[PDB]
């Protein structure tokens, strides 16, 4: 299952798939602030990338983040190592309902900051997972709306290239498909 849409010279695609098997130059990891290994998409990414990824992320923690956590909504970039994709942009989504009045803004920041980095570094293509909707508990209907709104607005105003949202389930995909149809019509 897949749906594609042109936004100026950019393309947005939603697809069912495994983000560790993508053809985009960049994939996004829904990471934790400590840049340590976890479960879910982060776990799959570390497994597929191999053990150099954790080592590189810890070097980034200690050398660029002065030994501290990556803040919610912010991004760093590493190699993809054994992944097919060449780079991983790691971001930290909000933990649902910890900070309800800021969480929509912070989730949007994950998308905007990743896309800005792709734009400025001319990285051409990028896949996102469904950030915050696993261990971090964010309802998929609300998250999908924020993700798509943020991505679409960015692609209306900026030259980026190809953006995919890669969903691990038909259910998550079907929710994205409904929202995208609504935003494309509206
Ligand atoms: N291989 C995959 N390809 C594409 N999407 C995937 C894949 N595997 C899972 N997903 C989807 O990816 C989405 C995100 O679910 P979560 O992976 O839990 O991310 P979070 O931001 O909520 O939690 C980050 C925390 O969990 C980690 O331990 C971190 O280390 C942190 O502790 C869901 O739709 C998944 O079904």
9 is annotated as contributing to ligand binding: no
77 is annotated as contributing to ligand binding: no
Tally the domains of the chain. Answer: 1
**Ligand 1: residues whose CB is within 6 Å?**
18-20, 30-32, 38-42, 44, 93, 129-136, 166, 168, 172
Distance CA 12, CA 61 (A): 32
Q: Identify the domain containing residue 63 by its residue range.
A: 1-186
Both structure tokens of 30: 């829904």
Q: Which residues are catalytic?
A: 42
- Give the DSSP letter string of 83-139: SSSSEEEEE-PPPTTTSTTTHHHHHHHHHHHHHHHHHHHT--EEEE--TTSSTT---
State the closest ligand 1 atom to the C-alpha of 93, by its place in the atom list counted from 1.
Answer: 21
> What is the stated resolution of the deposited model, in angstroms?
1.4
Both structure tokens of 154: 């960015």
Ligand 1 centroid–CA 133 distance in Å is 7
Q: Which CATH number do you get for residue 89? A: 3.40.220.10
State the CB neighbour count (10 A cutoff) for residue 38.
16
Technique used: X-ray
Sheet-wide strand order for 162-167: 2-7, 10-16, 162-167, 125-128, 26-30, 87-91, 75-79
Ligand 1 centroid–CA 25 distance in Å is 19
Length of the chain: 186
Protein residue with its CA nearest to atom 9 in ligand 1: 41
Distance CA 156, CA 160 (A): 10
The 3-state DSSP class for residue 149 equals helix
């Amino acid at each position: 299952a897949s749906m594609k849409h042109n936004i100026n010279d950019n393309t947005l695609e939603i697809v069912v798939g495994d983000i560790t098997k993508e053809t985009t130059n960049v994939i996004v990891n829904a990471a934790n602030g400590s840049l340590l290994g976890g479960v879910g998409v982060d776990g799959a990414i570390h497994h597929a990338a191999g053990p150099e990824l954790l080592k590189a992320c810890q070097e980034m923690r200690n050398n660029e983040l002065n030994g501290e956590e990556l803040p919610t909504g912010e991004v760093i970039i590493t190699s993809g190592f054994q992944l097919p994709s060449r780079f991983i942009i790691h971001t930290v989504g909000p933990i649902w309902n910890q900070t309800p009045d800021l969480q929509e803004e912070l989730l949007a920041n994950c998308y905007r900051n990743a896309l800005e980095l792709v734009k400025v570094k001319k990285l051409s293509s990028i896949s996102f997972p469904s950030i915050s909707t696993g261990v971090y508990g964010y309802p998929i209907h609300e998250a999908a709306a924020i993700a798509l709104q943020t991505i679409i607005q960015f692609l209306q105003e900026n030259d980026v290239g190809l953006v995919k949202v890669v969903l691990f389930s038909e259910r998550d995909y079907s929710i994205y498909q409904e929202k995208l149809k609504y935003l494309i019509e509206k």
